[PDB]
Amino acid sequence: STGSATTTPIDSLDDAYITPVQIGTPAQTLNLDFDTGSSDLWVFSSETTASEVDGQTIYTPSKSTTAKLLSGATWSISYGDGSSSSGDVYTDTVSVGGLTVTGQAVESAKKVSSSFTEDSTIDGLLGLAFSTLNTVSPTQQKTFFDNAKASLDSPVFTADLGYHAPGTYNFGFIDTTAYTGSITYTAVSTKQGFWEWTSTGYAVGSGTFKSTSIDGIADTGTTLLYLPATVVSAYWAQVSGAKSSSSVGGYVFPCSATLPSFTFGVGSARIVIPGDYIDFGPISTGSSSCFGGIQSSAGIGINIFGDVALKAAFVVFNGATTPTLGFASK
């Protein structure tokens, strides 16, 4: 089997991407944030505290003839950005782009933090990191990909995120028309439950490539590119007027600037992030100070190849016995 679903930016800045997911019988379609940095599929639901729902589409398991309460199961998760959610668990039929999993754990939110409430466009998350990170207790549950794997034509899914435009998540096949040149595959460590890999270095604009190992995670659920302070300093030094602002919470730059590109290494290959991808617009409405899309990972504890990086590539998440990551230009 295979699946193919379009993923759409939630706003003009590509702050995140939503992908329609069918849950239950009859289908209830929710727009979920596919997140290769976490491993819970959770949804706004009929059980979510009413004051914490503000425009989201909810899953109502009582209206699904295939929903079954997973007795005794609860979940609770906190994300790198400080947001959190928690609740109980159903199993139900979940389909993504024509690909169907029966008995998928659908984690029903009883509580969500304010940032989820305040984002009316995201109805929940669909985790695509390794199932070892799944928070369901007392019986850990498998991700949608993990459940689908054995049925897939090939045990892979691919992320093809658009810049200010829709893109695609595919399951079970590699669309050879979706990228240019070749896919370069690189080793993954699953030791922390992430799609963790080692970039071979970087360049800023038309500058020389610096060969240096950068361990980080391919994370579709993180907006920006978080890299070591040395790297990030080298980037923003090439933008006149750019500075790190503790009050704003990162590097800012004059909105009048033209941003240089940023290149990262995948083995001997090179992915080029155009400078426009690195502009996340005014820090506040009407401001001429703009927020940068490359930020320091210092104090995160891990480097994150978030959407800013991933959207410049066709990315293969190879879930073979020994997982690997593939990157192609597009």
Side-chain angles (χ1 to χ4, degrees), residues 181-190 192-206:
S182 297
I183 308 178
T184 296
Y185 290 87
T186 195
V188 163
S189 175
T190 65
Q192 292 188 99
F194 300 117
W195 291 92
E196 186 172 2
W197 64 292
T198 301
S199 173
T200 48
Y202 71 97
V204 177
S206 58

mmCIF file with all atom_site columns, all heavy atoms in Angstrom, residues 181-206, unseen atoms left out:
data_model
loop_
_atom_site.group_PDB
_atom_site.id
_atom_site.type_symbol
_atom_site.label_atom_id
_atom_site.label_alt_id
_atom_site.label_comp_id
_atom_site.label_asym_id
_atom_site.label_entity_id
_atom_site.label_seq_id
_atom_site.pdbx_PDB_ins_code
_atom_site.Cartn_x
_atom_site.Cartn_y
_atom_site.Cartn_z
_atom_site.occupancy
_atom_site.B_iso_or_equiv
_atom_site.pdbx_formal_charge
_atom_site.auth_seq_id
_atom_site.auth_comp_id
_atom_site.auth_asym_id
_atom_site.auth_atom_id
_atom_site.pdbx_PDB_model_num
ATOM 1   N N   . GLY A 1 181 ? 18.357 15.689 -9.316 1.00 0.00 ? 181 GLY A N   1
ATOM 2   C CA  . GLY A 1 181 ? 19.547 14.925 -8.998 1.00 0.00 ? 181 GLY A CA  1
ATOM 3   C C   . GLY A 1 181 ? 19.238 13.646 -8.240 1.00 0.00 ? 181 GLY A C   1
ATOM 4   O O   . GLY A 1 181 ? 18.248 12.974 -8.520 1.00 0.00 ? 181 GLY A O   1
ATOM 5   N N   . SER A 1 182 ? 20.104 13.315 -7.289 1.00 0.00 ? 182 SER A N   1
ATOM 6   C CA  . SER A 1 182 ? 19.986 12.080 -6.524 1.00 0.00 ? 182 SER A CA  1
ATOM 7   C C   . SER A 1 182 ? 19.649 12.334 -5.076 1.00 0.00 ? 182 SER A C   1
ATOM 8   O O   . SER A 1 182 ? 19.860 13.430 -4.558 1.00 0.00 ? 182 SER A O   1
ATOM 9   C CB  . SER A 1 182 ? 21.287 11.288 -6.600 1.00 0.00 ? 182 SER A CB  1
ATOM 10  O OG  . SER A 1 182 ? 21.512 10.930 -7.943 1.00 0.00 ? 182 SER A OG  1
ATOM 11  N N   . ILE A 1 183 ? 19.154 11.292 -4.421 1.00 0.00 ? 183 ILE A N   1
ATOM 12  C CA  . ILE A 1 183 ? 18.943 11.326 -2.993 1.00 0.00 ? 183 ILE A CA  1
ATOM 13  C C   . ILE A 1 183 ? 20.227 10.849 -2.326 1.00 0.00 ? 183 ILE A C   1
ATOM 14  O O   . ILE A 1 183 ? 20.749 9.797  -2.665 1.00 0.00 ? 183 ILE A O   1
ATOM 15  C CB  . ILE A 1 183 ? 17.773 10.464 -2.583 1.00 0.00 ? 183 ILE A CB  1
ATOM 16  C CG1 . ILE A 1 183 ? 16.539 10.830 -3.407 1.00 0.00 ? 183 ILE A CG1 1
ATOM 17  C CG2 . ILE A 1 183 ? 17.529 10.619 -1.096 1.00 0.00 ? 183 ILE A CG2 1
ATOM 18  C CD1 . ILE A 1 183 ? 15.328 9.991  -3.111 1.00 0.00 ? 183 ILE A CD1 1
ATOM 19  N N   . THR A 1 184 ? 20.733 11.631 -1.384 1.00 0.00 ? 184 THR A N   1
ATOM 20  C CA  . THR A 1 184 ? 21.902 11.234 -0.629 1.00 0.00 ? 184 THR A CA  1
ATOM 21  C C   . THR A 1 184 ? 21.440 10.762 0.728  1.00 0.00 ? 184 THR A C   1
ATOM 22  O O   . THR A 1 184 ? 20.829 11.507 1.490  1.00 0.00 ? 184 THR A O   1
ATOM 23  C CB  . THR A 1 184 ? 22.921 12.373 -0.465 1.00 0.00 ? 184 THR A CB  1
ATOM 24  O OG1 . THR A 1 184 ? 23.422 12.735 -1.754 1.00 0.00 ? 184 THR A OG1 1
ATOM 25  C CG2 . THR A 1 184 ? 24.098 11.928 0.400  1.00 0.00 ? 184 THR A CG2 1
ATOM 26  N N   . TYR A 1 185 ? 21.756 9.515  1.033  1.00 0.00 ? 185 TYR A N   1
ATOM 27  C CA  . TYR A 1 185 ? 21.370 8.930  2.299  1.00 0.00 ? 185 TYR A CA  1
ATOM 28  C C   . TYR A 1 185 ? 22.487 9.030  3.322  1.00 0.00 ? 185 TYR A C   1
ATOM 29  O O   . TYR A 1 185 ? 23.676 8.959  3.000  1.00 0.00 ? 185 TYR A O   1
ATOM 30  C CB  . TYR A 1 185 ? 20.952 7.480  2.093  1.00 0.00 ? 185 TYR A CB  1
ATOM 31  C CG  . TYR A 1 185 ? 19.644 7.342  1.355  1.00 0.00 ? 185 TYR A CG  1
ATOM 32  C CD1 . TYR A 1 185 ? 19.600 7.321  -0.026 1.00 0.00 ? 185 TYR A CD1 1
ATOM 33  C CD2 . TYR A 1 185 ? 18.454 7.230  2.046  1.00 0.00 ? 185 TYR A CD2 1
ATOM 34  C CE1 . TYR A 1 185 ? 18.388 7.173  -0.707 1.00 0.00 ? 185 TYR A CE1 1
ATOM 35  C CE2 . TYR A 1 185 ? 17.249 7.098  1.385  1.00 0.00 ? 185 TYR A CE2 1
ATOM 36  C CZ  . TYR A 1 185 ? 17.216 7.073  0.010  1.00 0.00 ? 185 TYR A CZ  1
ATOM 37  O OH  . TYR A 1 185 ? 16.000 6.924  -0.619 1.00 0.00 ? 185 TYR A OH  1
ATOM 38  N N   . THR A 1 186 ? 22.072 9.181  4.569  1.00 0.00 ? 186 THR A N   1
ATOM 39  C CA  . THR A 1 186 ? 22.990 9.423  5.655  1.00 0.00 ? 186 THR A CA  1
ATOM 40  C C   . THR A 1 186 ? 22.495 8.653  6.881  1.00 0.00 ? 186 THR A C   1
ATOM 41  O O   . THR A 1 186 ? 21.292 8.394  7.030  1.00 0.00 ? 186 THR A O   1
ATOM 42  C CB  . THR A 1 186 ? 23.110 10.946 5.920  1.00 0.00 ? 186 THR A CB  1
ATOM 43  O OG1 . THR A 1 186 ? 24.258 11.229 6.734  1.00 0.00 ? 186 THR A OG1 1
ATOM 44  C CG2 . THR A 1 186 ? 21.810 11.509 6.547  1.00 0.00 ? 186 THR A CG2 1
ATOM 45  N N   . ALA A 1 187 ? 23.429 8.272  7.742  1.00 0.00 ? 187 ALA A N   1
ATOM 46  C CA  . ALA A 1 187 ? 23.121 7.432  8.894  1.00 0.00 ? 187 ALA A CA  1
ATOM 47  C C   . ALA A 1 187 ? 22.230 8.125  9.917  1.00 0.00 ? 187 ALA A C   1
ATOM 48  O O   . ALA A 1 187 ? 22.298 9.334  10.110 1.00 0.00 ? 187 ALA A O   1
ATOM 49  C CB  . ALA A 1 187 ? 24.410 6.973  9.569  1.00 0.00 ? 187 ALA A CB  1
ATOM 50  N N   . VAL A 1 188 ? 21.399 7.329  10.576 1.00 0.00 ? 188 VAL A N   1
ATOM 51  C CA  . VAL A 1 188 ? 20.523 7.815  11.629 1.00 0.00 ? 188 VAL A CA  1
ATOM 52  C C   . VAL A 1 188 ? 20.836 7.107  12.930 1.00 0.00 ? 188 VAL A C   1
ATOM 53  O O   . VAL A 1 188 ? 21.083 5.910  12.936 1.00 0.00 ? 188 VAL A O   1
ATOM 54  C CB  . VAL A 1 188 ? 19.047 7.605  11.249 1.00 0.00 ? 188 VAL A CB  1
ATOM 55  C CG1 . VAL A 1 188 ? 18.138 7.724  12.476 1.00 0.00 ? 188 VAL A CG1 1
ATOM 56  C CG2 . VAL A 1 188 ? 18.634 8.607  10.157 1.00 0.00 ? 188 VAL A CG2 1
ATOM 57  N N   . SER A 1 189 ? 20.830 7.861  14.026 1.00 0.00 ? 189 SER A N   1
ATOM 58  C CA  . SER A 1 189 ? 20.800 7.287  15.358 1.00 0.00 ? 189 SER A CA  1
ATOM 59  C C   . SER A 1 189 ? 19.396 7.374  15.909 1.00 0.00 ? 189 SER A C   1
ATOM 60  O O   . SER A 1 189 ? 18.822 8.450  15.936 1.00 0.00 ? 189 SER A O   1
ATOM 61  C CB  . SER A 1 189 ? 21.738 8.016  16.303 1.00 0.00 ? 189 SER A CB  1
ATOM 62  O OG  . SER A 1 189 ? 21.583 7.487  17.603 1.00 0.00 ? 189 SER A OG  1
ATOM 63  N N   . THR A 1 190 ? 18.857 6.253  16.369 1.00 0.00 ? 190 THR A N   1
ATOM 64  C CA  . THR A 1 190 ? 17.539 6.250  16.987 1.00 0.00 ? 190 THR A CA  1
ATOM 65  C C   . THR A 1 190 ? 17.625 6.284  18.518 1.00 0.00 ? 190 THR A C   1
ATOM 66  O O   . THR A 1 190 ? 16.607 6.175  19.202 1.00 0.00 ? 190 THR A O   1
ATOM 67  C CB  . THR A 1 190 ? 16.743 5.019  16.566 1.00 0.00 ? 190 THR A CB  1
ATOM 68  O OG1 . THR A 1 190 ? 17.393 3.852  17.069 1.00 0.00 ? 190 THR A OG1 1
ATOM 69  C CG2 . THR A 1 190 ? 16.639 4.934  15.045 1.00 0.00 ? 190 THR A CG2 1
ATOM 70  N N   . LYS A 1 191 ? 18.842 6.451  19.040 1.00 0.00 ? 191 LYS A N   1
ATOM 71  C CA  . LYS A 1 191 ? 19.124 6.355  20.476 1.00 0.00 ? 191 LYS A CA  1
ATOM 72  C C   . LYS A 1 191 ? 18.299 7.316  21.335 1.00 0.00 ? 191 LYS A C   1
ATOM 73  O O   . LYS A 1 191 ? 17.958 6.993  22.470 1.00 0.00 ? 191 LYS A O   1
ATOM 74  C CB  . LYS A 1 191 ? 20.620 6.599  20.729 1.00 0.00 ? 191 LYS A CB  1
ATOM 75  N N   . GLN A 1 192 ? 17.972 8.490  20.804 1.00 0.00 ? 192 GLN A N   1
ATOM 76  C CA  . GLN A 1 192 ? 17.118 9.438  21.526 1.00 0.00 ? 192 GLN A CA  1
ATOM 77  C C   . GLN A 1 192 ? 15.682 9.443  21.011 1.00 0.00 ? 192 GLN A C   1
ATOM 78  O O   . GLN A 1 192 ? 14.892 10.315 21.392 1.00 0.00 ? 192 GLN A O   1
ATOM 79  C CB  . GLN A 1 192 ? 17.680 10.860 21.434 1.00 0.00 ? 192 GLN A CB  1
ATOM 80  C CG  . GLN A 1 192 ? 18.979 11.104 22.175 1.00 0.00 ? 192 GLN A CG  1
ATOM 81  C CD  . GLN A 1 192 ? 19.335 12.574 22.180 1.00 0.00 ? 192 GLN A CD  1
ATOM 82  O OE1 . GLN A 1 192 ? 19.085 13.274 23.159 1.00 0.00 ? 192 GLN A OE1 1
ATOM 83  N NE2 . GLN A 1 192 ? 19.898 13.060 21.074 1.00 0.00 ? 192 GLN A NE2 1
ATOM 84  N N   . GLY A 1 193 ? 15.349 8.492  20.135 1.00 0.00 ? 193 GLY A N   1
ATOM 85  C CA  . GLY A 1 193 ? 14.004 8.378  19.599 1.00 0.00 ? 193 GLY A CA  1
ATOM 86  C C   . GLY A 1 193 ? 13.727 9.272  18.409 1.00 0.00 ? 193 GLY A C   1
ATOM 87  O O   . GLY A 1 193 ? 12.616 9.279  17.889 1.00 0.00 ? 193 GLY A O   1
ATOM 88  N N   . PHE A 1 194 ? 14.728 10.037 17.985 1.00 0.00 ? 194 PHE A N   1
ATOM 89  C CA  . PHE A 1 194 ? 14.553 10.999 16.896 1.00 0.00 ? 194 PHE A CA  1
ATOM 90  C C   . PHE A 1 194 ? 15.176 10.509 15.594 1.00 0.00 ? 194 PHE A C   1
ATOM 91  O O   . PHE A 1 194 ? 15.960 9.566  15.582 1.00 0.00 ? 194 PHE A O   1
ATOM 92  C CB  . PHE A 1 194 ? 15.197 12.350 17.248 1.00 0.00 ? 194 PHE A CB  1
ATOM 93  C CG  . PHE A 1 194 ? 14.639 13.013 18.482 1.00 0.00 ? 194 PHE A CG  1
ATOM 94  C CD1 . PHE A 1 194 ? 15.448 13.236 19.575 1.00 0.00 ? 194 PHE A CD1 1
ATOM 95  C CD2 . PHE A 1 194 ? 13.325 13.456 18.531 1.00 0.00 ? 194 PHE A CD2 1
ATOM 96  C CE1 . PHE A 1 194 ? 14.960 13.847 20.699 1.00 0.00 ? 194 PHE A CE1 1
ATOM 97  C CE2 . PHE A 1 194 ? 12.838 14.070 19.652 1.00 0.00 ? 194 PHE A CE2 1
ATOM 98  C CZ  . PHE A 1 194 ? 13.661 14.261 20.744 1.00 0.00 ? 194 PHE A CZ  1
ATOM 99  N N   . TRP A 1 195 ? 14.841 11.187 14.501 1.00 0.00 ? 195 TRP A N   1
ATOM 100 C CA  . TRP A 1 195 ? 15.536 11.007 13.239 1.00 0.00 ? 195 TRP A CA  1
ATOM 101 C C   . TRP A 1 195 ? 16.809 11.836 13.319 1.00 0.00 ? 195 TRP A C   1
ATOM 102 O O   . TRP A 1 195 ? 16.894 12.943 12.781 1.00 0.00 ? 195 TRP A O   1
ATOM 103 C CB  . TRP A 1 195 ? 14.656 11.427 12.076 1.00 0.00 ? 195 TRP A CB  1
ATOM 104 C CG  . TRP A 1 195 ? 13.489 10.484 11.866 1.00 0.00 ? 195 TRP A CG  1
ATOM 105 C CD1 . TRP A 1 195 ? 12.233 10.597 12.394 1.00 0.00 ? 195 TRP A CD1 1
ATOM 106 C CD2 . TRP A 1 195 ? 13.488 9.278  11.087 1.00 0.00 ? 195 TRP A CD2 1
ATOM 107 N NE1 . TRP A 1 195 ? 11.449 9.542  11.987 1.00 0.00 ? 195 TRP A NE1 1
ATOM 108 C CE2 . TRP A 1 195 ? 12.196 8.719  11.180 1.00 0.00 ? 195 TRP A CE2 1
ATOM 109 C CE3 . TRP A 1 195 ? 14.445 8.631  10.306 1.00 0.00 ? 195 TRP A CE3 1
ATOM 110 C CZ2 . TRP A 1 195 ? 11.843 7.540  10.519 1.00 0.00 ? 195 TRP A CZ2 1
ATOM 111 C CZ3 . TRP A 1 195 ? 14.091 7.466  9.654  1.00 0.00 ? 195 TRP A CZ3 1
ATOM 112 C CH2 . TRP A 1 195 ? 12.805 6.932  9.764  1.00 0.00 ? 195 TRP A CH2 1
ATOM 113 N N   . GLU A 1 196 ? 17.778 11.298 14.048 1.00 0.00 ? 196 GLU A N   1
ATOM 114 C CA  . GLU A 1 196 ? 18.997 12.027 14.387 1.00 0.00 ? 196 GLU A CA  1
ATOM 115 C C   . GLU A 1 196 ? 20.104 11.664 13.430 1.00 0.00 ? 196 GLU A C   1
ATOM 116 O O   . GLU A 1 196 ? 20.358 10.492 13.191 1.00 0.00 ? 196 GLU A O   1
ATOM 117 C CB  . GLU A 1 196 ? 19.418 11.720 15.817 1.00 0.00 ? 196 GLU A CB  1
ATOM 118 C CG  . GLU A 1 196 ? 20.595 12.541 16.293 1.00 0.00 ? 196 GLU A CG  1
ATOM 119 C CD  . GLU A 1 196 ? 20.852 12.347 17.756 1.00 0.00 ? 196 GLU A CD  1
ATOM 120 O OE1 . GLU A 1 196 ? 20.120 11.536 18.376 1.00 0.00 ? 196 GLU A OE1 1
ATOM 121 O OE2 . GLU A 1 196 ? 21.771 13.007 18.284 1.00 0.00 ? 196 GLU A OE2 1
ATOM 122 N N   . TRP A 1 197 ? 20.774 12.678 12.891 1.00 0.00 ? 197 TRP A N   1
ATOM 123 C CA  . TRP A 1 197 ? 21.791 12.456 11.873 1.00 0.00 ? 197 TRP A CA  1
ATOM 124 C C   . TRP A 1 197 ? 22.897 13.485 12.021 1.00 0.00 ? 197 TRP A C   1
ATOM 125 O O   . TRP A 1 197 ? 22.817 14.356 12.876 1.00 0.00 ? 197 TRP A O   1
ATOM 126 C CB  . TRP A 1 197 ? 21.168 12.522 10.481 1.00 0.00 ? 197 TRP A CB  1
ATOM 127 C CG  . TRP A 1 197 ? 20.598 13.870 10.146 1.00 0.00 ? 197 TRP A CG  1
ATOM 128 C CD1 . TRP A 1 197 ? 19.516 14.457 10.709 1.00 0.00 ? 197 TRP A CD1 1
ATOM 129 C CD2 . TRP A 1 197 ? 21.109 14.801 9.180  1.00 0.00 ? 197 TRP A CD2 1
ATOM 130 N NE1 . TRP A 1 197 ? 19.300 15.704 10.142 1.00 0.00 ? 197 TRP A NE1 1
ATOM 131 C CE2 . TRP A 1 197 ? 20.268 15.929 9.201  1.00 0.00 ? 197 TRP A CE2 1
ATOM 132 C CE3 . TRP A 1 197 ? 22.193 14.780 8.290  1.00 0.00 ? 197 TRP A CE3 1
ATOM 133 C CZ2 . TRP A 1 197 ? 20.479 17.028 8.371  1.00 0.00 ? 197 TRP A CZ2 1
ATOM 134 C CZ3 . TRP A 1 197 ? 22.394 15.870 7.467  1.00 0.00 ? 197 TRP A CZ3 1
ATOM 135 C CH2 . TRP A 1 197 ? 21.541 16.976 7.516  1.00 0.00 ? 197 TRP A CH2 1
ATOM 136 N N   . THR A 1 198 ? 23.928 13.379 11.200 1.00 0.00 ? 198 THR A N   1
ATOM 137 C CA  . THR A 1 198 ? 25.067 14.284 11.314 1.00 0.00 ? 198 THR A CA  1
ATOM 138 C C   . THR A 1 198 ? 25.322 14.968 9.990  1.00 0.00 ? 198 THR A C   1
ATOM 139 O O   . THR A 1 198 ? 25.739 14.345 9.017  1.00 0.00 ? 198 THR A O   1
ATOM 140 C CB  . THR A 1 198 ? 26.329 13.540 11.775 1.00 0.00 ? 198 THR A CB  1
ATOM 141 O OG1 . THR A 1 198 ? 26.069 12.937 13.041 1.00 0.00 ? 198 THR A OG1 1
ATOM 142 C CG2 . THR A 1 198 ? 27.506 14.503 11.940 1.00 0.00 ? 198 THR A CG2 1
ATOM 143 N N   . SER A 1 199 ? 25.030 16.262 9.954  1.00 0.00 ? 199 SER A N   1
ATOM 144 C CA  . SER A 1 199 ? 25.360 17.072 8.807  1.00 0.00 ? 199 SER A CA  1
ATOM 145 C C   . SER A 1 199 ? 26.871 17.214 8.703  1.00 0.00 ? 199 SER A C   1
ATOM 146 O O   . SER A 1 199 ? 27.582 17.242 9.699  1.00 0.00 ? 199 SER A O   1
ATOM 147 C CB  . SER A 1 199 ? 24.699 18.454 8.905  1.00 0.00 ? 199 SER A CB  1
ATOM 148 O OG  . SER A 1 199 ? 25.157 19.295 7.865  1.00 0.00 ? 199 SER A OG  1
ATOM 149 N N   . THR A 1 200 ? 27.355 17.330 7.484  1.00 0.00 ? 200 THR A N   1
ATOM 150 C CA  . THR A 1 200 ? 28.779 17.361 7.255  1.00 0.00 ? 200 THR A CA  1
ATOM 151 C C   . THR A 1 200 ? 29.337 18.766 7.195  1.00 0.00 ? 200 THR A C   1
ATOM 152 O O   . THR A 1 200 ? 30.544 18.933 6.999  1.00 0.00 ? 200 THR A O   1
ATOM 153 C CB  . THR A 1 200 ? 29.127 16.642 5.965  1.00 0.00 ? 200 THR A CB  1
ATOM 154 O OG1 . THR A 1 200 ? 28.266 17.101 4.920  1.00 0.00 ? 200 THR A OG1 1
ATOM 155 C CG2 . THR A 1 200 ? 28.954 15.165 6.153  1.00 0.00 ? 200 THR A CG2 1
ATOM 156 N N   . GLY A 1 201 ? 28.482 19.774 7.374  1.00 0.00 ? 201 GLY A N   1
ATOM 157 C CA  . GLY A 1 201 ? 28.978 21.139 7.467  1.00 0.00 ? 201 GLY A CA  1
ATOM 158 C C   . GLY A 1 201 ? 28.053 22.174 6.864  1.00 0.00 ? 201 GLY A C   1
ATOM 159 O O   . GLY A 1 201 ? 26.877 21.915 6.631  1.00 0.00 ? 201 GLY A O   1
ATOM 160 N N   . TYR A 1 202 ? 28.588 23.354 6.578  1.00 0.00 ? 202 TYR A N   1
ATOM 161 C CA  . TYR A 1 202 ? 27.723 24.423 6.135  1.00 0.00 ? 202 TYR A CA  1
ATOM 162 C C   . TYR A 1 202 ? 28.468 25.483 5.353  1.00 0.00 ? 202 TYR A C   1
ATOM 163 O O   . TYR A 1 202 ? 29.688 25.593 5.429  1.00 0.00 ? 202 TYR A O   1
ATOM 164 C CB  . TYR A 1 202 ? 27.035 25.070 7.332  1.00 0.00 ? 202 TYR A CB  1
ATOM 165 C CG  . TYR A 1 202 ? 27.972 25.885 8.196  1.00 0.00 ? 202 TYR A CG  1
ATOM 166 C CD1 . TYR A 1 202 ? 28.072 27.262 8.040  1.00 0.00 ? 202 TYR A CD1 1
ATOM 167 C CD2 . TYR A 1 202 ? 28.768 25.273 9.155  1.00 0.00 ? 202 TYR A CD2 1
ATOM 168 C CE1 . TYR A 1 202 ? 28.929 27.996 8.815  1.00 0.00 ? 202 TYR A CE1 1
ATOM 169 C CE2 . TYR A 1 202 ? 29.626 25.999 9.930  1.00 0.00 ? 202 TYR A CE2 1
ATOM 170 C CZ  . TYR A 1 202 ? 29.700 27.360 9.759  1.00 0.00 ? 202 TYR A CZ  1
ATOM 171 O OH  . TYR A 1 202 ? 30.568 28.073 10.534 1.00 0.00 ? 202 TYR A OH  1
ATOM 172 N N   . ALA A 1 203 ? 27.700 26.267 4.605  1.00 0.00 ? 203 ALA A N   1
ATOM 173 C CA  . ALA A 1 203 ? 28.210 27.485 3.982  1.00 0.00 ? 203 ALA A CA  1
ATOM 174 C C   . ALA A 1 203 ? 27.190 28.592 4.168  1.00 0.00 ? 203 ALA A C   1
ATOM 175 O O   . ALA A 1 203 ? 25.990 28.335 4.286  1.00 0.00 ? 203 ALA A O   1
ATOM 176 C CB  . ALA A 1 203 ? 28.492 27.279 2.503  1.00 0.00 ? 203 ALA A CB  1
ATOM 177 N N   . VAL A 1 204 ? 27.687 29.824 4.173  1.00 0.00 ? 204 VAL A N   1
ATOM 178 C CA  . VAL A 1 204 ? 26.841 31.007 4.260  1.00 0.00 ? 204 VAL A CA  1
ATOM 179 C C   . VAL A 1 204 ? 26.928 31.747 2.934  1.00 0.00 ? 204 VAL A C   1
ATOM 180 O O   . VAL A 1 204 ? 28.020 32.170 2.509  1.00 0.00 ? 204 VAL A O   1
ATOM 181 C CB  . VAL A 1 204 ? 27.268 31.917 5.413  1.00 0.00 ? 204 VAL A CB  1
ATOM 182 C CG1 . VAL A 1 204 ? 26.429 33.163 5.426  1.00 0.00 ? 204 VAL A CG1 1
ATOM 183 C CG2 . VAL A 1 204 ? 27.153 31.181 6.728  1.00 0.00 ? 204 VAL A CG2 1
ATOM 184 N N   . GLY A 1 205 ? 25.786 31.930 2.292  1.00 0.00 ? 205 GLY A N   1
ATOM 185 C CA  . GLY A 1 205 ? 25.756 32.601 1.007  1.00 0.00 ? 205 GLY A CA  1
ATOM 186 C C   . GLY A 1 205 ? 26.701 31.930 0.036  1.00 0.00 ? 205 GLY A C   1
ATOM 187 O O   . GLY A 1 205 ? 26.681 30.712 -0.109 1.00 0.00 ? 205 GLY A O   1
ATOM 188 N N   . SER A 1 206 ? 27.540 32.723 -0.619 1.00 0.00 ? 206 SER A N   1
ATOM 189 C CA  . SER A 1 206 ? 28.462 32.198 -1.615 1.00 0.00 ? 206 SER A CA  1
ATOM 190 C C   . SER A 1 206 ? 29.818 31.853 -1.002 1.00 0.00 ? 206 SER A C   1
ATOM 191 O O   . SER A 1 206 ? 30.806 31.653 -1.714 1.00 0.00 ? 206 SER A O   1
ATOM 192 C CB  . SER A 1 206 ? 28.646 33.224 -2.724 1.00 0.00 ? 206 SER A CB  1
ATOM 193 O OG  . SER A 1 206 ? 29.133 34.426 -2.155 1.00 0.00 ? 206 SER A OG  1
#
